[PDB]
Structures are given as C-alpha cells and as structure tokens.
TrEMBL record, chains A, B:
Post-translational modification N6-methyllysine, affected residues: K142, K162, K168, K195, K296, K298, K420, K433, K448, K454
Keyword Transferase belongs to the record: yes
One GO MF term attached to the UniProt entry: protein histidine kinase activity
GO biological process: detection of visible light; phosphorelay signal transduction system; regulation of DNA-templated transcription
Domain Phytochrome chromophore attachment site per the UniProt entry, residue ranges: 129-286
Name of the protein this chain belongs to: histidine kinase
Major enzyme class: transferase
Iron among keywords: no
Keywords, ordered alphabetically: ATP-binding, Chromophore, Kinase, Nucleotide-binding, Phosphoprotein, Photoreceptor protein, Receptor, Sensory transduction, Transferase
Full protein segment contained here: 9 to 501 of 850
Length: 488, 488
C-alpha cells in the first residue's frame, strides 16, 4: 500500500531490530508477558520465558535495580548492567500503556555520554544565524558520529520536507535543496517522532526478530513507541535499500513544541550506535533544537524591527511631499524590501505601476477588480493565484502568488506583492542518478518523490509566512493612516 | 435574572429606541414585513404598513435609491434623504438574515463626517506609546463629542474589564483603575460588539417603541444585530440609570481581530448623535484600533529585544567568571528586569537566595520540590499558587503567582519569579459614593461589580502574559545552555 500512507500503525510492528533483545513485563515488572525470539541467543537463556517471574528470568539482583529506575514515559538508560551469568548489557527501561519494556544490547563502557556532547554543543552555541547553526551542524555531526551522509530535513507549511543542509562522502549523491512530499513522512510517524527524540536503523537489509506473543490474550499488541529497538516500516526500509543506505540515525528537531524537521544520518554499511553515543546525540539534538528556536525568534524580531524602521522612514517622507500619490509611484518598488517578493506593483487611481516579476499590464484590471471584491479593506494573500482566478494560470511562471495591501480606506487602491511559482525559484542544479527498485516499485526513490512534489506545487508560489502577513498588516495601517491625513 | 447573564438574546429585543423609526422589508425590499409603532408619527403615515409595498409606503423615488445602496452586512449610511411628503431623514440601510432593515432619524446636514474625524485622527496618529494614545483619546473624545464622561475599558485575560483611561466633568465619580467582572459584559454582547463597531443609547429612561410583528408567521424574530436603533438590555439600562447616566455611546476597539476593549461615553442628560457625527466617531474608532494594534506590536518587539540584550550581557559575564553558581547568586536579582515581577528567587544547590516579595525562607523547600515534579525541564507558571499548593495561601499577600525557569538540564536548580496578589498591586485610591438601585437590586452598581471582581481574584496574581512566557523560555535556553558549558 503506497497511498493512504498515514494508515500503517508503525508504533506496534510486532518485531524489533536484530542489534538488541526486548523483554516486556507487567506494569510492576513481576511477570514476563512478552519477549523477543533472540532473548535466548544474547542473555544465554533456554526455552520460552513467557510466564516465568522477572526475578527468575533476569535475576533478583538485576530486577531490584530495574525497579528503582521506574521509580522515576522517558526511557531510563542503564549502561553496563550485569546478568546472573556475568554478561554485561546496556539496558533501556521505559513504561508505556501500563507495560514495562526492557531493551538489552551489548555493552559500551569506553565512550563518555556527557563529555562528547559538551564539546559538540560548544561548537553550535556561538552560531549567530539559523543558516550558520544549520550549515555547521551537518558538517559537525558527520565528523563526530562518522555517518556517510548527514542531512537537515526541514518541514514546509504544506508538510513537504526540504533538505536545507548536507554533509556527505564525495562519492555519494547530493539531496541539498530538493523537496519531498508530505506523504514521504506520514502523520503517525511525525506524531511518534514528537515522542521519540532519537531513532536508529542498525540494518535496513537486516532480518527483523519477532516479539512473542505478537498479539496477547486480551487481543492488544505491544506498543513500541518509546522502544529504541522497534523495527521500522518496510516501506521506509525499502526506500533506504533503494538509496544504497544500509543504516540510519535521525534526530527530532523540536521548535516551539512543533516538529521543525530532522537531523537525518545515512550509513552505506550497517551501523549500531552504543547507548552512550546515542545519549550524547540525544543531548546535542535537544540543544540544537533550543538554539535554532532562539535564533528563529531573533530573526523574526529583526525582520519586523527592520520593516518598522522602513515604514517610519516612508512616513517621514510623506510629511514633506504634498502629493502622496506621487510619492508612492516613486517609492513603491522600495516596499519589496519589507516582504520577500519576486515583484511588487502599485494600483493607484485606476493606474498600474510595476517593478520586478509582475503579471502582464493587460491582466491587472481583472486582478485589481478581483482583489477589490474579496479584500474587504484588510490584507489578502494567496500562493495559488490560479485557484482564485483561472485566467492567471497563463502568467504563473511570472506571478503564481500575490499578497495585496490596501493603501486607501476610502478609494480602491492597492500595493500588490508577487512571487514566481516555487519551481522557478528552485535551486538544486540534477537527479541524473538512477536507483535500483525493490518489490513495491520506483515510488520509493528520491528521484520519484521529488518528481511527485514538483507536480504538487505547480502554478504555486512560496507561501506567505506569518511574518510576511504581520509586516503587510503593519504596512496597511501605516499607508491607510497617512492616506487619511491627505484626504483628496 | 442576574446570573447565567450570557442567556439573554440582546440581538432580537423586539423593540427599538425612540430617537428613530424602523422598517423591515423582504430580502429584495418589495414588501414591508415589519415596522416600528412610531413609523406613523415621524414619516407622517396613517394605519398599519405591514403588507403594503415598499414603493407605496416610502415612495417609488426613494425605494429606487435605497435598492442601489444594497447593490453594495455593512450598513449603508444615506444622509438627508427626502420622503414623498418632503420631510428629510438620515437613513441607515443594511441586509442581515435575508431581511432588509431601514432605520430613519431626523436629518443633520450641518456636521461634516470626514473633516471632523480627519482632525481627531491627526491628534492620535503621532502618539508613540500605548499609554500616550490611550490617555489622549479619552480627553480628546470628551472635548469633541462633548460626553460628560469618557472611559477606555480594557478586557483582561479572564474577561474582566479594567478602566485604563478616563476624562470626566469634575463633579462626576472616577472609575479609573477599577476592574469589573467578565459577567458585567456577557459573551453574546462581545460577539455583537465585534459585529457593531459603534453603539448609541439616546435615553436609558426612554420608553422603548415595539416592532410589529415582534415574532412573525414563520415564528422567527427580527435580528437587530446591525440595527443602530436596537433597544439595549434592561439589565444594562438599569445599570446606567443607577449610575445617573441618561445616555451612552461605546466604540469597539478591535486589535488582531480580538475585542481589546471599549471607548465608552456617558452623558447625564439624554443625547442623540446625528448620522454624520456617528460616522466620524466610527472612523476614529477604526484608526484608534489600528494605531493601538501597531503600538502594542512595537512594545512586544521592544520588551523582547530588551530581554535578548540582557541575556547576551549575562552570557558575556558567564564567559569570564569560572564559578557560574557564584555568578547567579550575585546576579539573580537582575533577572527581575526581564519579566515584570514583585520578587525573584534563586534555588541552586539546595540553597535559597531571595530578592523582593518572595515566599518565606521555610516555605521554599516545599515549593522547590513541587516545581521539580510538575516542571519537566520546561518553564512552569501560575497566577494562583494556592490552587497548586493549598499551604501557599498563608503568603498569598506576598507571593500569589509564580513563574519557574529551570537553569540546569541535569541538576534540579530554578530561577523563581513571584507576584503579589492583584488586590495588593491595586491602585484606585475610594468608591465612597452610594448609588440608587432599581427593581433588580444593588448588583447593578459599579460599587458591587468591583466588590464581586475583588473576591474573584483573591489569592491570585496578575497573570503571566504570552510575552512573560516568551522571555522566560528564552532565559531557560540561555541559562540551561551556559550551565552545560560549565558541567560540574
Ligand atoms: C506511503 C508511504 C511512504 C513512506 C512512509 C514512511 N516514511 C517514514 C519515514 C521517513 N521517510 C523519510 C524520507 C527520506 N529520508 C531520506 O534520507 C530521504 C532522502 C532523499 C528521504 C526522502 C525519512 C527521513 C523518514 C524518517 C525515518 C527515520 O526516523 O530515520 C516512515 C516512518 C518509519 C518508521 O517506521 O518509523 C513511514 C511509515 N515514505 C515514503 O516515501 C512513502 C511513499
Ligand atoms: C447579568 C447581567 C449583567 C449585565 C449585562 C449586560 N451588560 C451589557 C453591556 C455593558 N456593560 C458595561 C459595563 C459598564 N459600563 C460602564 O460605564 C461601567 C462603569 C462603571 C460599567 C460597569 C458596558 C460598558 C456595557 C456596554 C454597553 C454599550 O455598548 O454602551 C450588556 C449588553 C447591552 C446590550 O443590550 O447591547 C448586557 C446584556 N451587566 C451587568 O453588570 C450584569 C450584572
């Protein structure tokens, strides 16, 4: 099924990843309800474990220490824990839907979990712009965790993902500046990714180990939402195998409690991160998120400060010039400085004055009449002009988006901002690389995903941000206010 | 009924105000469905009008011009229109719920509707602060429209109204700085006030003239939402009569599409504003709203700019000092500069350091433990501390509100901001004046309304604004970020 993607319940796969073993106990960790087939192979146990008491299975010495963890749904990390037979394991212990889930993996005592991160964070803390934090992060994460490719994948308004930063081995293909459909990361995944900060895929071509029982007596599956060993969707694993990506590690970037995007790592060989390096990467993820949040806030405060200053400058000029209509005709191009636009236009006294990428002179009367019907003396905007006026499809390559600012309360005069269709402004330079395809078809390749997105945004501009509308509303109040001062 | 206030359907009173007459016609203004009893007295008509055709009743010459108005639910203002018998009327014409409503009133051709407003707006446009716009507006509106009292009544988070500005005759009582319950202006009214910019009460002791029919054949009343003659609730009219207020004119202040508050005018004698002065006041209302919106935005941008600068200054100090714990103990009082607070405290290394109005030393351990349970490494805040900790009622007169900023990701260390209970910070200086009371009791007086509000906010502080939380979150990321840099 490669449609209704949001359907698949990824949280309850009924499988885990080979690189560790999973024991699910009751709410109070007394009786083993479920286990992973490989529990035997790794712990050195014989036979079925389901019905045996936690104290019996793992040991009275270990089960005691694990009870003190849950005394804290944030998974408790217990590095280098000992079994009765002496073997040493790193243990992830969490409690979700009144089910205690214990994950075991071969132990790492070499790496330091705080020290590693403290140095990584130190290098991104002093970044003074969103672009500087982002650029350095991919490069940094690659050098440190040694993944063949690191992307920052940022989510657009429409749910589509743009690759805004990339560090990679020279040999590998670049996805920098390419967009991907909202469907490529469906809604239940983003819901899960807001819960699980960090995520591993040890092997995309690995054999997934089943959890027994898959479904229990009461007829409910084992929710592996907060289980780091949870096996990933076969749709995504095929997608990674088609890209020649054997292993994966993604970090959830959380800004203002939204999912802003992912730090996504690819490895061409199989790769297991140890509990300690996964804690470090998780901490870096949190700090990277916090800094990007504050840098985004500073940019918003700056963008608007800069627009306020521009309008004060223009209101001081309007005090000196007698003819305001004359001042606007000489000045209107300068408003393209407030709101990112490919063109700006002035419709004043049934006359049209254009600058940059605007619709054709003959097409404006239609537009001016239309805006004057739906505006209602407030800011009107759209990124899909042709959806509002079919006639406007002809010039979508020039002006696909329009934001309209009324400049007179009384008269029907407008300041019109325009944007080219997003595929025009597209800067990726080509996806010449051909990709091998598995059972499910050529849909599961970056080449097709990109082709799909490009159709989904045809005749459509870069949407107007909250900041573009905030500035536009402030410009309306400034222009309407000073146009009243010069009444006829 | 002086409870469940939101019940009363003020929009369909089945009455109008004496100072004009009302004719409701069908959707296309052909047949007179309803009229006000006084239609006869003012238009010079005899008998019932309900069933007679619009062309017959008002005239073919007039009904034609009225059809061209609805060719525009914004009421069309038609000043100095003539009837068949020669009489001259100002006419408000609107169409709501497929019912054309025509309001007539004695004509004013003396006042200029734009010129008056253009001068008023000119005096508020150059205001550079919310306090300066507000202060000048009451004073200005009083001098111009000549009302005995003008208030600006601002709505609080909890729906309560504060009187933030006042111009009045020396003899009259001051309501400056007094709050009023959310119930005093119920929800259906605010819903109506978002629709009707401006509102008149010609006489609070006037005899309301009934609309016939009150309820029609189809069993639906006449919606007078956009009718300027709509009779006001008898609850409010009694309230005004108890205040010695004979007439009223309120203006809806709309900021970011919210109802921010009202410019409320009181007159001790009866007072009808003419259509032209009502248009002017309506225009001023719009401009006053637009400017206050932009001044509010500038203040928000400034408040946060100022907090960013403060934290950068503090992060530069943290680079020089080795012991960060020492720097915070010396500096924490300075954070009271970021967020308006009556006290600030530092809980670091199980030690307490206080500055300003904070809870007692002995009470902090309880607080520090509590915050450390519900915080979850993010900013936690409340204006009703005693609702979270009953024990905290004892010191509500000192600290009724608390905002808590984590300063360490690892350790349980907090920066605690405090606010006194709102009745402490209360600056109104007394309501000695006694008020006469009508049939419905002493509830309908400012004295009682204020007593009611004062109980509704006991043990409660001034709520933490979006701006206080925005700054607090930015301070968390700054302090948590630099505390990681100085790991143990
Ligand atoms: C219709 C179903 C589809 C689908 C489902 C799906 N995708 C999921 C995760 C996921 N997808 C991406 C996409 C990319 N990663 C890349 O590196 C590139 C490179 C060009 C692309 C396009 C990513 C990053 C992820 C996140 C996986 C991770 O956390 O590492 C999932 C959720 C996986 C899970 O089981 O948790 C599902 C389901 N993807 C499709 O493309 C389609 C058609
Ligand atoms: C339980 C019912 C009550 C109630 C209902 C009610 N109030 C309405 C309007 C209204 N109330 C105020 C309040 C004041 N105005 C003042 O000047 C002062 C001065 C101290 C106070 C406290 C105001 C300003 C208004 C707005 C009226 C206007 O637009 O001029 C209404 C709506 C009236 C209508 O029919 O449109 C209703 C209903 N008010 C109560 O106090 C109570 C108990």
């Amino acid at each position: 099924d490669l449609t209704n993607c949001d359907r698949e319940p990824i949280h309850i796969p009924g499988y885990i990843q080979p690189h560790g073993c999973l024991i699910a106990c009751d709410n109070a960790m007394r009786m083993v309800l479920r286990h992973s087939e490989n529990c035997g192979e790794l712990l050195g146990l014989e036979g079925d474990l389901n019905g045996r008491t936690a104290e019996d299975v793992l040991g009275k010495r270990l089960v005691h220490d694990l009870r003190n963890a849950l005394t804290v749904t944030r998974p408790a990390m217990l590095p280098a824990m000992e079994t009765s037979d002496g073997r040493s394991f790193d243990i992830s212990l969490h409690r979700y839907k009144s089910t205690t889930i214990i994950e075991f993996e071969p132990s790492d005592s070499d790496t330091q979990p705080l020290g590693t991160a403290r140095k990584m964070v130190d290098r991104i803390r002093e970044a003074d712009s969103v672009e500087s934090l982002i650029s350095r992060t991919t490069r940094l994460v690659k050098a440190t965790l040694g993944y063949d490719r690191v992307l920052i994948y940022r989510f657009e308004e429409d749910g589509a993902g743009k690759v805004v930063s990339e560090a990679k081995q020279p040999e590998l293909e670049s996805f920098l500046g390419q967009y991907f459909p909202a469907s490529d990361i469906p809604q239940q995944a983003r819901a899960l990714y807001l819960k699980n900060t960090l995520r591993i895929i040890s092997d995309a071509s690995g054999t997934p180990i089943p959890v027994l029982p898959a479904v229990d007596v009461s007829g409910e599956p084992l929710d592996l939402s907060y289980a780091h060993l949870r096996n990933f969707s076969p749709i995504h694993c095929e997608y990674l195998r088609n890209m020649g990506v054997a292993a994966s590690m993604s970090i959830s970037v959380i800004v203002d409690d939204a999912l802003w995007g992912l730090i996504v790592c690819h490895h061409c060989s199989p790769r297991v991160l140890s509990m300690p390096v996964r804690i470090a990467a998780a901490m870096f993820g949190e700090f990277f998120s916090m800094f990007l949040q504050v840098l985004k806030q500073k940019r918003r405060l700056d963008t608007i400060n800069h627009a306020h200053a521009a309008l004060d400058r223009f209101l001081r000029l309007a005090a000196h010039r007698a003819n305001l209509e004359e001042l606007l005709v000489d000045s209107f191009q300068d408003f393209a400085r407030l709101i990112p636009c490919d063109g700006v236009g002035l419709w004043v006294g049934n006359n049209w004055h254009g600058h940059g990428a605007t619709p054709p002179h003959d097409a404006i009367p239609r537009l001016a009449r239309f805006v004057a019907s739906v505006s209602e003396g407030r800011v009107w905007a759209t990124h899909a002009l042709s959806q509002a006026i079919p006639e406007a499809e002809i010039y979508a390559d020039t002006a696909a988006g329009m934001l309209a600012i009324p400049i007179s309360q009384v008269k029907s005069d407008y300041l019109l901002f325009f944007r080219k269709e997003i595929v025009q402004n597209l800067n990726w330079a080509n996806p010449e690389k051909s990709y091998e395809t598995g059972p499910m078809g050529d849909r599961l390749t970056p080449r097709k995903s990109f082709a799909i997105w490009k159709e989904s945004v045809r005749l459509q501009a870069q949407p107007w941000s909250e900041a573009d509308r905030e500035i536009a509303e402030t410009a309306r109040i400034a222009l309407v206010g000073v146009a009243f001062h010069h009444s006829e």
